[PDB]
Design a protein around this ligand. Structure first.
Ligand SMILES: C/C=C\C=C\[C@@H]1O[C@](O)([C@H](CC)C(=O)NC/C=C\C=C(/C)[C@@H](OC)[C@@H](C)[C@@H]2O[C@H](/C=C/C=C/C=C(\C)C(=O)c3c(O)cc[nH]c3=O)[C@H](O)[C@@H]2O)[C@H](O)[C@H](O)C1(C)C
Ligand SMILES: Nc1nc2c(ncn2[C@@H]2O[C@H](COP(=O)(O)OP(=O)(O)O)[C@@H](O)[C@H]2O)c(=O)[nH]1
Ligand SMILES: [Mg+2]
Ligand SMILES: [Mg+2]
Ligand SMILES: [Mg+2]
Ligand SMILES: [Mg+2]
Ligand SMILES: [Mg+2]
Ligand SMILES: [Mg+2]
Ligand SMILES: [Mg+2]
Ligand SMILES: [Mg+2]
Ligand SMILES: [Mg+2]
Ligand SMILES: [Mg+2]
Lengths: 205, 82, 371, 85
RNA sequence: AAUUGAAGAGUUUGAUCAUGGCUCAGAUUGAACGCUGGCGGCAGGCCUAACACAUGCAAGUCGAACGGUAACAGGAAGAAGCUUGCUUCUUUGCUGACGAGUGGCGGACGGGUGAGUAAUGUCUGGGAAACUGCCUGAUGGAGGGGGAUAACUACUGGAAACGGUAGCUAAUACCGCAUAACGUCGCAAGACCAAAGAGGGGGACCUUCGGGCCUCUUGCCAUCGGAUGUGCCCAGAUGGGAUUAGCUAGUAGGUGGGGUAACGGCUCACCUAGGCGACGAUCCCUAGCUGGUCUGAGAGGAUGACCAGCCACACUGGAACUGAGACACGGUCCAGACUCCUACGGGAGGCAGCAGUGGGGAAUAUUGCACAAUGGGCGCAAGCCUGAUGCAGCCAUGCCGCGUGUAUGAAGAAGGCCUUCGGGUUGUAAAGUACUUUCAGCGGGGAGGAAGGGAGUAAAGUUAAUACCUUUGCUCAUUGACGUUACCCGCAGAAGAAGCACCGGCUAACUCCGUGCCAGCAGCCGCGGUAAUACGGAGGGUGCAAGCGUUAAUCGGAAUUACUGGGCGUAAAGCGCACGCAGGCGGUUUGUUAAGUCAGAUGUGAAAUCCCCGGGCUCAACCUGGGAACUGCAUCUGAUACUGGCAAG
């Protein structure tokens, strides 16, 4: 059950650079976007504790498209594994196939990448998959089948892909719609817009 | 009587057979004596899925374990002694 | 449940609603015995005429049993007026013929018992003429109706003449009742009229299939008083005989799975899923006349609380009328809105009966539904 | 029913009759041997033991009570008789 | 790389501290209920009445045991209405087969339920005093007989169940004889005690011209062992109660007999008068136990859902027989209740098996398909059947996954609501433009579960033998309920698919209208007496999502039974005081014992499950390989510091 509904209000509920819609139509602070000025605009009640942690969990979940139960399963797997629980959780979240497509550029938005993955616009190692929860291993290759080539869907996504920067672990060619995933990311390369140990504290509670 | 036979333990529509030495008075899923190995029907025939212990099979046959049709068929499928 | 019934000689329903203690049960038993000999509470006996297979319903002739008798006659395709030739017409007989005409029984056959109890050849003709005049004056057919005289209890005694007479009675019964019309066009529907609990089998519900067919293993929906639920049929039967499909128009017993005797009462309907939905208020046009059509005389007003009899049962209801009618004086050809307590699955064009004080006031046809 | 139990029942009854007859005759032979032993005789007791030995051993070989049962009574009887004979 | 390990908050009071209980924030279940609800995979589905049951089925097989033929495919012994080729009658009991019947085997296994049972149960570790069909290896034998008896006949008691009469009556049924070792008794000597021979080829040796005989498949009588399923005994552990302190005399033991497949008061006769018990005897209540499961960092607490091992049970109770293996789960006898049938002479029954019905309950399933695969039992074998099992149906009962769409669009329209009357707001939300069509749905193609076995044959052993049989391969057909297979490919359109709870602090979420301690919410604090972010409604936000809330039970927070890890002057708590037994502990030094303790090694801790490293189902759920762990238990050898046994001070 992928989330569906308003997105600008969803983003302004927290107020961050979570991510935006792929199309842009006057995306700026025209009059009221996230910190609405004029006669009102109370943005933060400033809750004492566990509230910022809940907000971080919610923004993480809505960015990645994952539900609460699956996110908690991922957290439990990360805690069971070695290393740091937060980075292991972020590694699993990025290894989710939909985020791989989004960061490779074939998905204009993360929701669009999930839609494509469901509609079988993606293949891994020469095999179709219709699960946005698949975990990719290092040193792998993920291709796009010939049917998804003729999609203005994908053309716009690949056009918008090259306006951003590029990651440490993905190398994608659009002459064949194929991307090699070499290594796994880390907190250094990941955006520093959230805290992981607060989330760890919350579900360890 | 003591015999070597196959017991089913896999999930629905994906069976899994274990070859084992068990007295005939017990059931298929019932108790046994000594495990011998497994034979996967689907077998995922890129990797393994067929592992029998011919030494234990021979030792129990020497003591009186009656070979079953499926065990003999699996032996003929893999090899007499290889 | 050990006989595989053959759907030959299409089923026709015949009901005896004759006079009380005048030989209805004896007459139907004699008919069954003579037919099974020469051919090899509501009592539902059956017999296979060479022409058509008939189910004979001996209904209670008591006035207090009129409520179930309404369904027994609506269930019925041909009426047999069983009356003594030594007493002639009776108030009970007149009430029964009025009820039969109000429920809409087309074909009626008159039978005169105690033929040999009268040593004359004029009193029998006098009483036959009297009952014929009664029929002709109470909006019934006339000289084109087979009238049957004879003894109803001597038909079981060792004889030949009365056996031939009752065989001739059965013959023109099957002659005067032609192949009836059946309504197997729309999805399956069966109003319930009785419930039995078979030990080892389950709950079975009896009734006449209003429309559609029922195959063994089909899903059906129970719709009716306070409840709309689902169920599955297993083992369609009829008169303790094995069946394969159930057509419309014959009284059959359908076995339901997951049915509670106290939870399922009379008044509900077994329909196909998603066909009809129960309602508590609906709009209908009334057809009451001035004084000589059952309706009362004094100009009653709003708040009237009559029983609205339907295919199965009845319920006390209230009536509201649109503006323009200060009084609801008899002579109501207008349309009004009727609200009922118990919801019953209904459709447009349904004909119901308005009754009160043991007498029918008027008719009504469903026009729209307000749920 | 037409199950095998009825045939099993009648076969069991017939076997019961046969085994009861054999056990009863063996018990009577053993009783006579014991009566000879307790009476104080020494040669007749030996003769009775030598007469009872073949029948009890034959029944044990046929397999109706036990080979060990036959061996134990033979041992008890010989231990009784050899004390005085 | 195989336990790296722990949250608090509110509430006594005008405020503080402490004690102390109450409540809440988490998991989890065989869950129930209310609302809602699209699909698929996996698992689960009478916890209560071991309450009572209609109906159908679950254990038959073997003609290669036998006398037989009721069948009837009937070629065929014979005849023909003689459809111009094969059709019909007693069918010769005659083949293949088969009704019953005798006979061998499993019906003591498969399956289900925890009523009973506090040790006769179960787990762990030990033993001897014993058995064992089917599976085996070795040693040896299979000779000649006799008499039973079923079917069947007819008489005929009965509605049936079942019967008496005479044999026909055969064997691998039964019983003597030839015998007696490796067997049993006995110190030997001696005695005892055994079988069954069936099927096939037919060379030919003779030839009852089938047969013995060359013979293969066997099966059978005995012994010695293995394996196996057991029976028996001991030690430790395994619930509550002392408002349960004596119990027991077949009870404790011995002497002999009997009995048990074996030990033993198991039993008998006698003698001895003990035995058990404060470490809880006896008695009462409750209870299936274990591997495990849940909750926990841990020690701990609860429990025995699914599955596996064991025990006990089959309407209640008692008893025995057959059988190696039962006091017998679809064998037998009898007492009692209930139900049913009867011709009123008399008979049948026990769903805690699969389903299914009545009753109970908060509450839980279809009277399906199949031996297709495995397994089970029978048989030369093909082959029989299996409600075991596998698949199918319903239920969101639990876990997992996917889908309801993606950018647009400022017009910050419509309409709802609020406003310091500017505007905001649901709100980019919708329409649109481009689409993708996952999964529903329609139509096609379509893997695999299938390994076997059977028909021919090539080669090898067996024997004049290529007869006959068996074994190593090759050609021939088959062998799926699941299953409109999984899956894939095409098809029009987002077109066919979202709800629940909460919004005063605990805890994530704010405004209006109306009622006015009223109606009403709630787990607590606590609200609600005209202005309720708390009540009812509305608007709008938050938390989960085909699932959300209430309730039911366990633990945690509760350090609130605390051994790790509490306290007793004033909160609950030092007996009113003293003596003293059993009991607990014990000053200093030496020697000696190895008991407690420590070390090393062995076996074992069933499998399953947790965990770790991997693998396959589109990843997962799920399944599976290996490893560790299961901290336990017993045994062999050392250590002598400490506690302790013994000897000295
Ligand atoms: C009677 C109750 C149950 C009926 C059930 C339902 O009836 C019906 O709804 C029915 C609708 C037609 C109904 O409502 N009937 C129920 C209610 C309404 C009654 C219907 C029919 C009438 O018409 C107004 C009906 C008598 C009508 O009169 C005509 C002639 C008149 C006859 C004389 C008798 C009458 C009266 C009379 O007052 C009278 C008289 O005048 C002189 C002497 N002494 C009398 O006593 C003709 O004969 C028609 O038949 C359907 O038949 C359904 O199928 C139904 C069976 C479900
Ligand atoms: N004498 C005579 N009596 C009759 C005749 N028909 C019927 N009966 C009587 O009717 C009685 C049966 O009545 P029953 O059918 O049970 O009453 P109902 O059901 O109310 O009609 C019998 O006792 C007969 O004596 C007839 O033709 N002659
Ligand atoms: Mg149970
Ligand atoms: Mg003794
Ligand atoms: Mg109990
Ligand atoms: Mg039974
Ligand atoms: Mg704790
Ligand atoms: Mg505690
Ligand atoms: Mg304290
Ligand atoms: Mg005090
Ligand atoms: Mg004091
Ligand atoms: Mg005091």
């Amino acid at each position: 059950a992928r989330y569906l509904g308003p997105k600008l209000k969803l983003s302004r509920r927290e107020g961050t650079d979570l991510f935006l819609k792929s199309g842009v139509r006057a995306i700026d602070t025209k009059c009221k976007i996230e910190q609405a000025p004029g006669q009102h605009g109370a943005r933060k009640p400033r809750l004492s504790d566990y509230g910022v942690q809940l907000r971080e969990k919610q923004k993480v979940r809505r960015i990645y498209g994952v539900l609460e139960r699956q996110f908690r399963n991922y957290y439990k797997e990360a805690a069971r594994l070695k290393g740091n629980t937060g980075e292991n959780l972020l590694a699993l979240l990025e290894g989710r196939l939909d985020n791989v497509v989004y960061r490779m550029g074939f998905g204009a938005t993360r929701a669009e990448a999930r839609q494509l993955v469901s509609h079988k616009a993606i293949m891994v190692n020469g095999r179709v998959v219709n699960i946005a929860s698949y975990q990719v291993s290092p040193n792998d290759v993920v291709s796009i089948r010939e049917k998804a080539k003729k999609q203005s869907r994908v053309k716009a996504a690949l056009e918008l892909a090259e306006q951003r920067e590029k990651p440490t672990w993905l190398e994608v060619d659009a002459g064949k719609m194929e991307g090699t995933f070499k290594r796994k990311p880390e907190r250094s390369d990941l955006s520093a817009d959230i805290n992981e140990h607060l989330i760890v504290e919350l579900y360890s509670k | 009587m003591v015999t070597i036979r196959l017991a089913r333990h896999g999930a629905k529509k994906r069976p899994f057979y274990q070859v084992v030495v068990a007295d005939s008075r017990n059931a298929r899923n019932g108790r046994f004596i000594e495990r011998v190995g497994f034979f996967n029907p689907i077998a995922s025939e890129k990797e393994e899925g067929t592992r029998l212990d011919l030494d234990r099979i021979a030792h129990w046959v020497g003591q009186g374990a009656t070979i079953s049709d499926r065990v003999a068929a699996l032996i003929k499928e893999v090899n007499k002694a290889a | 449940s050990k006989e595989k019934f053959e759907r030959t000689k299409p089923h026709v329903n015949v009901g005896t609603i004759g006079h009380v203690d005048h030989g209805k049960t004896t007459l139907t038993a004699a008919i069954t015995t003579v037919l099974a000999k020469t051919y090899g509470n509501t009592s539902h006996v059956e017999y296979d005429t060479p022409t058509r297979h008939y189910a004979h319903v001996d209904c209670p002739g008591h006035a207090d049993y009129v409520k179930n008798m309404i369904t027994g006659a609506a269930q019925m395709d041909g009426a047999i007026l069983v009356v003594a030739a030594t007493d002639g017409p009776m108030p009970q007989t007149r009430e029964h013929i009025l009820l039969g005409r109000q429920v809409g029984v087309p074909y009626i056959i008159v039978f005169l018992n105690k033929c040999d109890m009268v040593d004359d050849e004029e009193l029998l003709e006098l009483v036959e003429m009297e009952v014929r005049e009664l029929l002709s004056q109470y909006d019934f057919p006339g000289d084109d109706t087979p009238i049957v005289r004879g003894s109803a209890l001597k038909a079981l005694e060792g004889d030949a003449e009365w056996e031939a007479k009752i065989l001739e009675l059965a013959g023109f019964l099957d002659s005067y009742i032609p192949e009836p019309e059946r309504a197997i066009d729309k999805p399956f529907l069966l109003p319930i009229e009785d419930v039995f609990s078979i030990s080892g089998r389950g709950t079975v519900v009896t009734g006449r299939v209003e429309r559609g067919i029922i195959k063994v293993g089909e899903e059906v929906e129970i719709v009716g008083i306070k409840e709309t639920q689902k169920s599955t049929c297993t083992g369609v039967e009829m008169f303790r005989k094995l069946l394969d499909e159930g057509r419309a128009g014959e009284n059959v017993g359908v076995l339901l799975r997951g049915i509670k005797r106290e939870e399922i009462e009379r008044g509900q309907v077994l329909a196909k899923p998603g066909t009809i939905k129960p309602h508590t208020k609906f709009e209908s046009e009334v057809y009451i006349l001035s004084k000589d059509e059952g309706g009362r005389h004094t100009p009653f007003f709003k708040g009237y609380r009559p029983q609205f009899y339907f295919r199965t049962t009845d319920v006390t209801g209230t009536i509201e009328l649109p503006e323009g009618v200060e009084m609801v004086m008899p002579g109501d050809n207008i349309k009004m809105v009727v609200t009922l307590i118990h919801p019953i699955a209904m459709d447009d064009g349904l004909r119901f009966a308005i009754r009160e004080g043991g007498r029918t006031v008027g008719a009504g046809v469903v026009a729209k539904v307000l749920s | 029913n037409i199950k095998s139990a009825k045939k099993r029942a009648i076969q069991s009854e017939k076997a019961r009759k046969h085994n009861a007859s054999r056990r009863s005759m063996m018990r009577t032979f053993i009783k006579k041997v014991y009566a000879a032993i307790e009476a104080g005789d020494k040669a007749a007791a030996q003769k009775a033991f030598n007469e009872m030995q073949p029948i009890v051993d034959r029944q044990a070989a046929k397999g109706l009570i036990h080979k060990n049962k036959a061996a134990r009574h033979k041992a008890n009887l010989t231990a009784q008789i050899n004390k005085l004979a």
